[PDB]
Amino acid sequence: VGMSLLALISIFASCYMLVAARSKCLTPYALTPGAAVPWTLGILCCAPRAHA
């Protein structure tokens, strides 16, 4: 039980860190009426798939 719980905690922490890093990298692009840099769009998936 201890090992399983620790593994789940670590994997959740890593997933949260990835999501937060994505949000922090793509936050400034929704504060401008500009383009999303398809180069960055491919690597960093965002909610706008085709629009904007």
Added chain:
Amino acid sequence: KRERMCMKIENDCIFEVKHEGKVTGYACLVGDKVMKPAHVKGVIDNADLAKLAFKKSSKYDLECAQIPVHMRSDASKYTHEKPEGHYNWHHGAVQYSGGRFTIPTGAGKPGDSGRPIFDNKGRVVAIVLGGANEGSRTALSVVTWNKDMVTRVTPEGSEEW
């Protein structure tokens, strides 16, 4: 002529924010994005604009959302060029010198955050947050734009209006 055009744009593109019955700030429609400073708290005095989902970023102190389809024609147009000179404002004229926005009279008042600073052609350049009292003048802590980047300019001693 320029004053009338600027006021006409301001009537159709600026909305007061209501909180506890007292005005705290303004939300403006620039391009296709709703604008609002983050530190200003309240709700937009508009049923349609109140239900939008806002993306918050405390690094730049701004909250933005996608404007509804039926208000797209009643929104201002923007630019990213800032030549040296003077620019219009609802409270008069602002002096732009050396990358700084300065209020000649120091007439800024708390609760006026969210009022865009306009260009000579009626385009929006930046969104004000607060002002720092430098002697008889008052420098503006303002949120401006590069070609595709937002930058937050904050002079020392700025107070969030």
Added chain:
Amino acid sequence: KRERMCMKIENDCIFEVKHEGKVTGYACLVGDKVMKPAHVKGVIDNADLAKLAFKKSSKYDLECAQIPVHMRSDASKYTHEKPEGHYNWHHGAVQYSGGRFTIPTGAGKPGDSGRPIFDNKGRVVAIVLGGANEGSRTALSVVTWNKDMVTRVTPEGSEEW
């Protein structure tokens, strides 16, 4: 002058497409290729045009074909430059502002799809597919050309006419 030339060009470079006896769209000659919106259904009121093999593509919602030799002198002249400002149209004048084609009148009606959007010198800029109701205005969903590429610009909420 400009209006008369534009309507004379439109007469020589537009053929009505009728379905069940009623017109639903228009196919126009640009350069050396017959262009028609793909979403519209019907047949062209022309023996030579109706018999051609129309290449299909759903991504750009466009049908294209090669014109015969004896209608080459009856085809418009194309271009790829899109300066900001005003352009001619069959139902008035269209405004190009901020990468968008908008209708000042907001009188767009189903059945006008496929009409070219004309330039100052009579050159064709884009092709009309549909528009989105921006309150008093309408943003057009049009198909334009780059230097060597086709692109489709569709504002949110657009309806096919």
